[PDB]
């Protein structure tokens, strides 16, 4: 009656004892002392029986034996050669007699050692027992990463060094190695994973939502799980009532915010979001019950249920589960021989983004030109003078914020009009954008198109036309979005009314700053006729959307480091 804590000590003792000697005969075969230790412990651990006898089995001298030990002849010879000693060859046996039979004294007791295989179970059709076998299972980690910079420590500095300028050792592991039964090198690689993860069973999430909906779900804030519609306005009073709605509608801290938690604090038992993480492709959140997405601007009160959405970005998993050091090591793995920025252009770019005295005249020009080639085709001299004057007065480059501005600079104002330093900066930036697109291209395999989607769209996000740029100057991206998919059920919402009309070439008489219908200014075609019955044509190619999305989602946020902001203009006062 050793109560609970000593029972758990007994638990651990049985654990380490089963792990300790399960195959000890072939384990410590070169150490005969341990074999005798285990065998003598085995013999002197069984309680003896009633000592009832009239005539028993004794040796030739007369000392009675204490039992029989039965094994197979292989282990008989293995213990007989060097581990245990022979006591005698014959023995005394009753008849209801001198019989040759070996016997060994172990510790304090004397025992027969039998390997009865020759006399019986030989040349007969009964299987010999004691060959029952086992069923063992092995655990074998595959692709974990040493998340801490504490854990990226070596034995000696250049243990596994190379000749490259970057040692191919920063990278997270992708394969594991072990030994076969013959001792040859064996390999598991992540290419072996289609038999588990690349099946349709990854999206069997419905029954878990049904089971999880049966729990006690409490009322939390409806900010990050709720989608509204546009209210057909000038987008000013909309952020108005958004401001005095958002100013007090959170009763506490939203749960999808605290990415600053480490590994252990996230997996701590006190975490309420720890029980909300089931599937790596899914985010589980508390949602309004029987409220359609999108719901109205005023959130209706309902009993809160749980809903789940797809994790399209693999980085949508929390950074306690996907560390920043791991992502940086992965980016280092990608960028071994790819294009990089020379220190001159990178210091110019960081100096012109961390400039706070930036004039708004560039903003005015970008707003009025609004990404139209016809506007830029008539403003060569003004743009040349403005760019030159801003450049050789503080050594900061300008008009690099807008993506519909700088390839124009390279194509038109690139023959030598500008100073040579700026043109090399723009060429390096476009070279980096093209190198990022090439990095996307080389890591996907073409030739397989399913449901009309190219493999570029199937593999990556910045090459899919379903996902769009944060800011659209032209309507060509929307045309590619609702034309390229054709199986993705589309729904576009522009401030109330659904859909666009894309009416371009607006003039003095009908500028109509207070326009509330779905006329959107696509832009004047340069090499064509505007017209009225002419259907709207894209300004540029399919690669325009790819390059623009790559720019807005790589160059701007990584260099700005989450400091720049997107905002709308007030043309009714700007013009």
């Amino acid at each position: 009656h050793l109560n609970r804590v000593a029972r758990a000590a007994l638990l651990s003792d049985l654990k380490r004892r089963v792990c300790a000697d399960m195959f000890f005969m072939t384990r410590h075969a070169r150490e005969p002392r341990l074999i005798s230790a285990y065998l003598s412990d085995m013999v002197s651990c069984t309680q003896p029986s009633v000592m009832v006898s009239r005539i028993t089995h004794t040796n030739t001298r007369g000392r009675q034996v204490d039992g029989v030990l039965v094994t197979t002849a292989t282990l008989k010879r293995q213990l007989l050669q060097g581990i245990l000693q022979i006591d005698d060859t014959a023995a005394d046996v009753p008849v209801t007699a001198r019989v040759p039979a070996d016997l060994v004294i172990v510790g304090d007791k004397l025992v027969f050692l039998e390997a009865l295989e020759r006399r019986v179970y030989q040349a007969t059709r009964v299987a010999y027992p004691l060959i029952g076998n086992i069923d063992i299972t092995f655990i074998m980690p595959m692709g974990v990463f040493q998340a801490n910079s504490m854990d990226r420590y070596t034995r000696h500095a250049g243990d596994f060094s190379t000749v490259s300028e970057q040692d191919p050792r920063q990278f997270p592991p992708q394969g594991i190695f072990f030994y076969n039964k013959d001792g040859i090198l064996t390999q598991l690689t992540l290419r072996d994973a289609m038999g588990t993860i690349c099946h349709s069973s990854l999206l069997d999430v419905e029954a878990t939502l049904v089971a999880l909906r049966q729990q006690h779900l409490d009322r939390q804030c409806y900010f990050g799980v709720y989608v509204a519609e546009g209210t057909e306005d000038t987008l000013d009073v909309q952020m108005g009532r958004f401001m005095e709605t958002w100013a007090d509608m959170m009763p506490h801290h939203p749960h999808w915010v605290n990415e600053h938690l480490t590994i252990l604090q996230f997996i701590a038992p006190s975490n309420p979001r720890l029980r909300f993480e089931l599937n790596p492709a899914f985010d589980f959140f508390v949602a309004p019950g029987d409220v359609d997405l999108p719901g109205p601007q005023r959130p209706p009160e309902a009993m809160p249920t749980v809903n789940a959405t797809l994790r399209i970005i693999n980085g949508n998993i929390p950074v306690p589960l996907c560390p920043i050091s791991f992502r940086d090591c992965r980016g280092t793995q990608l960028g071994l021989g790819r294009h990089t920025m020379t220190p001159a252009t990178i210091k110019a770019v960081k100096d012109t983004f961390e400039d706070r005295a930036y004039p708004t005249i560039f903003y005015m020009l970008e707003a009025v030109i609004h990404g139209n080639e016809r506007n830029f085709c008539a403003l060569l001299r003004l743009l040349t003078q403005c760019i030159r004057g801003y450049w050789e007065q503080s050594h900061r480059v300008a008009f690099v914020n807008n993506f519909h501005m700088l390839m124009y600079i390279t194509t038109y104002l690139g023959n030598g009009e500008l100073p040579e330093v700026c043109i090399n900066i723009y060429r390096d930036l476009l070279q980096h954008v093209r190198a990022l697109r090439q990095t996307i291209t080389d890591f996907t395999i073409q030739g397989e198109g399913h449901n009309g989607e190219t493999s570029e769209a199937l593999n990556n996000i910045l090459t899919d036309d379903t996902f769009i740029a944060p800011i659209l100057w032209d309507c060509d991206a929307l045309i590619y979005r609702d034309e390229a998919a054709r199986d993705r059920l589309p729904a576009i919402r522009v401030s109330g009314r659904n859909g666009y009309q894309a009416l371009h070439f607006v003039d003095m008489a009908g500028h109509n700053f207070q326009r509330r219908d779905n006329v959107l200014i696509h832009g004047r075609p340069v090499r064509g006729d505007t017209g009225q019955a002419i259907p709207i044509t894209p300004h540029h190619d399919r690669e325009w959307g790819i390059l623009s999305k790559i720019y807005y989602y790589i160059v701007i946020p990584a260099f700005s480091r989450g400091s720049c902001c997107t905002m709308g203009v007030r043309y009714d006062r700007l013009y």
Partner: protein
């Protein structure tokens, strides 16, 4: 719309927010300081938006958007470089569909998901038994005959009854698993396919499913048969002799890449919480595994990110290399 890179507040030559009003919808472009450009700005909105990004509900919720909070937190809290940060952002920007993950794995790209493989193995066992001296009282009866007619002659059936009694006070006889001898089952590499199993929900496009089964057929030793015989067990496609014995499956369980490695270095749980599969000797690099023969008694434990786990299996001093 437009983007301005830096916010200014003490520029009194131009009135604040007379040309722009802040309408930020992106986790990446969250602008807590630019919100003073909008009218009706107070201390409450600033102290509430310094921790929570301002995103309108009518332009996409954070849970419903493609770009979410973790990528924004990654880009706002990383200080390594700019080239490495941009390439890290590029490597983040990938789909997680089965077609996509197949693309990154057969390319060679490493997604942010860790794994384990589980391997059921069988071994021959020699058993060691010591019983006792006075353990059994064993009664014999008398032999009795039975003559029974047969096809050509007669059949004699001999019958002798008997009884056994264990006259032990407690546990007298103890057996123990002793030796290994020849392992009948293979310690190689065969991946466990799920495409055998049926009962889960199919996905919408059957050609995509057939293409996925075709891809899973490549790169494996056991695969489903190409005619797909319905009304049956779906036995695997045959071959000649597996080179050294019966192969064992390898079923995959996914973990985050942030996982305690020292947990797996002992006898651990396949689930991840005790409430035990023995890991063998293993390494994640070819160099450390060939080093792991104890060269200079060389225990290379971890070099940079690839790892070596010392053997926790019961087969410690067995299976020579």
């Amino acid at each position: 719309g437009l983007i301005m890179m830096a916010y200014q507040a003490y520029d009194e030559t131009i009135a604040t927010g007379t040309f722009f009003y802040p309408v930020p919808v992106n986790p990446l472009f969250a602008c807590p300081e630019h919100l003073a450009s909008l009218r009706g700005m107070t201390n409450a909105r600033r102290v509430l938006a310094k921790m929570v990004p301002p995103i309108p509900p009518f332009l996409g919720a954070n849970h419903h958007a493609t770009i979410r909070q973790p990528v924004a937190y990654h880009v706002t809290h990383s200080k390594s470089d700019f080239n490495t940060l941009t390439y890290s952002l590029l490597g983040g920007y990938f789909k997680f569909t089965p077609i996509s993950l197949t693309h990154q794995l057969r390319t060679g790209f490493h997604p942010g998901i860790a794994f384990t493989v589980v391997r059921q193995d069988r071994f021959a066992t020699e058993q060691l038994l010591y019983a006792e001296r006075a353990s059994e009282s064993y009664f014999v009866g008398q032999i009795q005959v039975h003559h029974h007619d047969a096809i050509g002659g007669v059949n004699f059936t001999l019958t002798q009854p008997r009884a056994h009694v264990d006259l032990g006070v407690g546990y007298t006889a103890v057996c123990a698993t002793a030796a290994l001898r020849c392992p009948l089952t293979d310690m190689g590499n065969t991946a466990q396919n799920l495409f055998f199993s049926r009962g889960g929900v199919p996905m919408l496009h059957d050609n995509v499913t057939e293409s996925l089964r075709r891809i899973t057929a490549s790169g494996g030793r056991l695969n489903p048969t190409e005619p797909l015989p319905i009304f049956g067990g779906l036995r695997p496609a045959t071959s000649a002799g597996i080179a050294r014995g019966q192969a064992s499956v390898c079923e995959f369980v996914a973990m985050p890449v942030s996982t305690d490695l020292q947990y797996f270095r002992t006898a651990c749980n396949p689930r991840g919480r005790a409430s035990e599969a023995y890991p063998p000797l293993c390494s994640s690099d070819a160099a450390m595994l060939r080093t792991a023969h104890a060269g200079e008694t060389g225990a290379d434990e971890v070099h940079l990110a690839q790892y070596l786990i010392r053997d926790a299996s019961p087969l410690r001093g067995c299976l020579p290399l």
